[PDB]
Subunit: 370 residues, 4 copies
């Protein structure tokens, strides 16, 4: 059973998700338009500050509290959930966990308050996201950094409220490039299978200059810093993917009670009711998986293995429940007007981002000695 503080938050975000987020989800998906009005209301709720102390502007909660919110948002609109997830985990977290009093005090308050978004630029075109692959070069001249390179698939990097993008550059540490830096160009959005409302851009740097004080962490330790906070993001996206799986149940249950076939609701036929029952089982064990992962994290125990399992299994519950949810909806399962249709498109990236399934299996395998 969930404690009051967490159960109260779950109820508030879920209420938010049904009353505020769901009515506009179809519009932003069709338009590919970033939901600024939803992000600002999430910011005023403090969701962007949940896993941060009131010191730097956060709400003094934890990552499990954020996880509960992401599950409730994931049920309804993945683009909104991933904007929150990526903002906290990829924008603010590298600055909060590796930035001095000045860096944290300059950038975090806006990020933590939902007034601004930050992104992390690691992936590059043609590069294998390894340490060996990073072809983006950075050179120090006096009190300013000079960056030359290109990044690919960077979330939250080109909104009207993006303040900075922390990037990786071979010198390899983490450098905070404010948006508006002359060499910093935000290329146009991608045409993606899904997450249509989520902001995603390629980035290019031609002799961009930023202050010396913008180095994130110690010179040479930025990639190591990233790996050390990856595990919280596996939990966060496991919760998002779990919400997706549950949203697919919820919609399919709703749809099965309305839609008729040969005089009875389609849920009266075992093939539909059993398929939905299995979907609810998948979502449930996905939820116990990431609760267990968060429990270890909050207790200070190791949670890398549990998070990797939680993320893989969750992502598979979302994909499987989306394919089943669209089957339950029939022709409507092929119409972007219906939530489960958008979930079918959106969920493919859940098996790929935050470490591919193959990466999670490698981690689990190494944990056994293989």
């Amino acid at each position: 059973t969930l404690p009051k503080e967490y159960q109260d938050l779950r109820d508030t975000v879920a209420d938010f998700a049904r009353s505020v987020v769901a009515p506009v989800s179809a519009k932003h998906d069709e338009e590919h338009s970033f939901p600024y009005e939803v992000v600002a209301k999430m910011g005023e709720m403090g969701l962007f500050g949940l896993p941060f102390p009131e010191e730097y502007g956060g709400m003094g909660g934890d990552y499990f509290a954020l996880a509960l919110a992401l599950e409730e948002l994931g049920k309804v609109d993945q683009s909104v959930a991933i904007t929150l997830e990526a903002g906290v985990g990829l924008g603010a977290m590298p600055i909060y966990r590796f930035g001095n009093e000045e860096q944290k005090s300059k950038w975090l308050p806006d990020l933590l308050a939902g007034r601004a978004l930050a992104g992390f630029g690691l992936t590059e075109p043609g590069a294998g996201s390894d340490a060996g692959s990073t072809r983006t070069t950075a050179r120090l001249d006096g009190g300013e950094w000079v960056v030359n390179g290109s990044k690919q698939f960077i979330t939250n990097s080109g909104t009207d409220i993006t303040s900075l993008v922390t990037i990786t550059a071979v010198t390899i540490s983490t450098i905070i490039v404010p948006s508006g830096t002359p060499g910093f160009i935000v290329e146009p959005v991608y045409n993606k299978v899904g997450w249509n409302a989520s902001d995603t851009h390629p980035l290019s740097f031609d002799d961009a200059r930023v202050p010396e004080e913008n180095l994130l962490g110690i010179r040479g330790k930025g990639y190591a810093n990233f790996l050390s906070i990856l595990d919280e993001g596996r939990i966060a996206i496991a919760a998002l993917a779990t919400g997706v799986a549950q949203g697919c149940v919820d919609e399919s249950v709703k749809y099965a009670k309305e839609r008729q076939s040969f005089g009875q609701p389609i849920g009266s036929y075992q093939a539909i009711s059993f398929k939905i029952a299995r979907m609810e089982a998948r979502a449930h064990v996905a939820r116990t998986a990431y609760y267990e992962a968060a429990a270890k994290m909050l207790a200070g125990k190791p949670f890398k293995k549990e998070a990797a399992i939680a993320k893989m299994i969750s992502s598979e519950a979302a994909m499987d429940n989306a394919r089943d949810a669209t089957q339950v909806h029939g022709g409507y399962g092929f119409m972007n007007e219906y939530p489960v249709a958008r979930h079918y498109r959106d969920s493919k990236i859940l098996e790929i981002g935050e470490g591919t399934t193959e990466v999670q299996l490698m981690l689990i395998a190494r944990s056994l000695g293989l």
Copy 2:
């Protein structure tokens, strides 16, 4: 081994698919634009007339030749493949199989030559596509049919070359009425925002007192739904072939991508996790292909092929869905980008489990064939 005539057609459509269809596939998907220039090239190739006798403008072939062509188109662009499949199976076939000499001579030559497209309007909003569910009424007043109702998810019903849409209508007496496009009560509503098949033409249809000549009654008064039920199996074979091509296309792309893309100094195809996944993908497409070849073989021998087609369609559609999820995995982040074929195959393929009889409907048929 495949006989010469069929291997020749397969090779020609494959060249067509790689040289003509693929280069423009990305533009049409992004734009949601109907590929008129591709449909015109398919029409001159004879593909819309492949299973129809020369008398009406056809090529004197069969549904297997059409299935071979659909597999090659499915590899590359599902919207183009389903435009052909629906044009033949739902546009020309109901007029060729149940229309009199006049109906056939007036409508088939343009359809069979690809100069026009035809649609079949059965599904309605709120209805379970049964005969008991058909709320679209058509009323005889003098010498004209007066139709009031609405159809949903009708393919090929609103292109610049759509000539007619045959609909099912209560007259529970259910007949089929040929509604030419341009009929005053006939409104083609705006396109749907669909998960996939972005380039394929799909519309809701509405009829507010549309009047058409009495000679437009297709088949016997009251037997139009029954006639539709009787010719369904060829389309199951046709779409199993399309889904088989999708499954194969996902393999082809993943193999090329796996040989180029690098990870830790070796192409990702050097790792068993990728190469075994692609090998399994290739196994799925192969047995899907043997399944629908057998269904067509029985059809061509004049033997029963309902059960074999139902299996071919189910297994094929699942090979497409599974191979699209694996192919996008192999492509990594690129698998989430509509510029890549496999990403479009992941979106497009979901309707393959739903149309031409849902998986649950195929399982029902197979079950009944066993005595269940």
Copy 3:
């Protein structure tokens, strides 16, 4: 994280499982011989008394404590685990939860101490285990009950230490038939796919007489009593099935480090190491599933839905991990000498007993309104 009391018990039974149970598992499986020496040592540990108060002879623990023990035993030998599971859940539990001070004081102390075993006879040949199907008739004459009928697949019903079999009989309540009752005949064991060492018998009753005081619960309420304690058994077998899944990982990990192919251990090839990594994920989420189920039960909250999901998912983790574990072992996967081979045979019944998968899906479906 697990509290000390539970973690201590988990360590003791696991130690028991490796040192006492595993050395004799192959012998009893080959011989189809009931492991009396293992059952007596489990009894002296008090495992048969774990979910019962010290009052009636039990150890004053809970069903979760029993669940932890069953997982550790399930890892090694299903026949031993199911003997414990069925003894507690089907022998003692109907008497503990529905028997008067005298009935509990007469029978439970031996059951709870592992000195005796009791079974539950509900299934009948040709009957669908519904209330409508029970063709076994019972008639009251004076101070004795007279029973006529036949039962099928009754666990623990014909060992040298079986004291009684509580049965269902249409009159429909629960009647305690002591072993040795003249009309009570124990037919010979079945040749089963698996659980070779587990005791299983058809039962036949031709005018057997037992005292009036032997009525279990109220006349007419015995089947209702059974349904009301079914949910604890779903948790118990979910834990057993989870242990099986983990045992298959453990053995496959052990085997993958020893067995060579083309100069390297077979776990160096991704196809083997990834398959084992997935197996560990299945066992892990099965374990979070039934922990969650037990948590609700111990808190007094409803746990029927959670138990049904836990049992289904667990049983599927055992079957899937057994098929993968035998693949990892190659030809040895087809040899009853190896634990994972016995797990492949044994696990089929996990999808069937304690409510079939179809029954669990029906329950989950009804919980959603379908």
Copy 4:
């Protein structure tokens, strides 16, 4: 449609399987007793001589005819089917394909007529079945080969009618030596306690200074493992057919059981959960059958069939495993009772994913065929 000769054989073996093999299948499984009376009846039917020319005692048929027969035997009893499959593929075939005129005339007539059984001893304890792993040495001393080593999991190597066991031996020069049974150093160790195939004869073999004539060298000195690798594909087809029969047998049994067994007043086959599961089972067996038919068709046309056989074998073995797990589910508690065919199919089928090249080996082959 199947040609007359093949349909005739299929019908005959099917009658055999239902009339002769099935009634005794339960007794042999419980007893672990080799079915000599079944093997003698198969021998007089010619099944062990089906793919061998008349000259050596065979029936002048092919491996497809044998595959058809194995599918019918697999439906009913896998131990009987694998006795035939291993007898032909591992006993007679290596002598027919690589032995001189004398070797063939001395050993093939009894094998091809079922009066004797032969085994192939390659696998050894601790070895990865590679040539580099073969630790069994055979030494030429005067005119006799002196063999020291051990073989593991050797089918048909210890029956009352086993005549010989061909083994692989280091001479890393690897040759094949024909060891007749009764040779002084040749010890047939006691049977294994196996998960399934309880009635099929399986033994570890040990050689402590066994001497056999020099004329027993099979093939060229040093080429015996290479020869074995070259004839593997026919056995993949043969066992895909066996696994296909297993898959079909599980359907057949589940259909009969589903029509009789009741639940809440209707047979369990009236519920979609059971009828759809059985319909899917039927789909799996059908596409498995189309897969291995295509592999055999290519083989018979003289075309490459390695890739097609590998797919047929993998997909077949998985159809058997999946259908056995579903069929035992349909049978409920009875699915856990060795008296029922599907329960025995659940135990027997696991080795179908492991023998005749593991699933991982088939995926490797398919992958290599794509350039991976």
